[PDB]
């Protein structure tokens, strides 16, 4: 999927990503961070993958090492449909806003002062990216 | 270097919209489109005051690392310290570039691209949003 670099997203700004969830989607990923080996956020909604049904799985990656994984409480995504995710962050946490008025915070484990990398994988085609 | 995006997958007939902020003391900026960084269907280079050119848009392509013959446009609907949006589509024969103030120009699809998968911004132009 889409790979963007030099995003230079800073605290106080909002990264908006809108796209299309494939009609027969099994899962999709949104990775954010410094680069492919340093992710402040691995956002992985699973419709049906690795034995999981309708669950968002999140984690970080530091120097290539995956951190402690966690399943989120909600799943506001549907196969074959439009969905927008919005991310902001500060020194301590990332805030992830999801469809249907849901949102959750994820610890800023890497202590990132900026987000410069984003990569989409799986059954999700990004159609629009906005800053602020 | 500004935002760099790959795996865009822009198909013929689809419109790529790029909106950004022209810096207050902008000398020039670049929008590169193509297959990848070495194969550009469009090097879009508005020059406010650079390389001896004043308020002039210069375009060219790059094929396998080789720059083609540069092309000068006849309009310059840009001004430092403001927002500007450019829209691009293509077919087999030309790309069509739509500029502010209702201006537009065509550039030959020299590399015969059937998709645009790469986009990069450079210079005094900060991308606020990209849609495709």
Q: What string of DSSP letters covers A18-79?
A: EEEE-TT--BEEEEEEEETTEEEEEEEEEEEETTEEEEEEEEEEETTEE---EE-S-----S
Length reported for chain B: 132
The phi, psi pair for B38, rounded to 5°, reads -100, -10
CA separation (Å) from B106 to A104, A108, B31, B98, B113? 46, 46, 15, 9, 15
Q: How many CA atoms lie within 13 A of A126 on its CB side?
A: 27
| Residue B17, C-beta contacts closer than 8 angstroms, at least 6 positions apart | B85, B86, B87, B129, B130, B131, B132
Contact A128 B130 (CB under 8 A): yes
Q: Would you say domain A1-132 falls under CATH 2.60.120.200?
A: yes
Task: Please provide the distance, in angstroms rounded to a whole number, between the alpha carbons at the two ends of chain B.
Answer: 21
Q: Which of residues 2-31 of A touch B (CB under 8 A)?
A: 2-7
Burial A95-122 (b: 16+ CB within 10 A, else e): ebebbeeeebebbbbbebeebbbbbbbb
Distance in angstroms (rounded) separating the CA atoms of residues B88 and B132: 10
Distance in angstroms (rounded) separating the CA atoms of residues B122 and A50: 41
Task: Please provide the distance, in angstroms rounded to a whole number, between the alpha carbons at the two ends of chain A.
Answer: 22
Domain boundaries, chain A: 1-132
Nearest to B40 by CA among B30, B49, B48: B30
B-chain residues within 8 Å CB-CB of A130? 128-130
| Elucidation method | X-ray
Resolution, Å (one decimal): 2.1
**Other C-beta atoms within 10 Å of A8: how many?**
13
Residue A17 Cα, gap to closest chain B Cα (Å) = 10
Nearest-CB residue to A3 (from B1, B2, B6): B6
Distance in angstroms (rounded) separating the CA atoms of residues B63 and A37: 31
- Residue B62 is encoded by which pair of tokens? 């790059």
Chain B contact for A132 (CB, 8 A cutoff) = yes
Chain B contact for A125 (CB, 8 A cutoff) = yes
């Amino acid at each position: 999927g889409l790979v963007a670099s030099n995003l230079n997203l800073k605290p106080g700004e909002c990264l908006r990503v809108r796209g299309e969830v494939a009609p027969d989607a099994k899962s999709f990923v949104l990775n954010l961070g410094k680069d492919s080996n340093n992710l402040c956020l691995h956002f992985n909604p699973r419709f049906n993958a690795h034995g999981d049904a309708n669950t968002i799985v999140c984690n970080s990656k530091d120097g290539g090492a995956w951190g402690t994984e966690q399943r989120e409480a909600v799943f506001p995504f549907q196969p074959g449909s439009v969905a927008e995710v919005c991310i902001t962050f500060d020194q301590a946490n990332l805030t992830v806003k999801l469809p249907d008025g849901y949102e959750f915070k994820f610890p800023n484990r890497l202590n990132l002062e900026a987000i410069n990398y984003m990569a989409a994988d799986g059954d999700f085609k990004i159609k629009c990216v906005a800053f602020d």
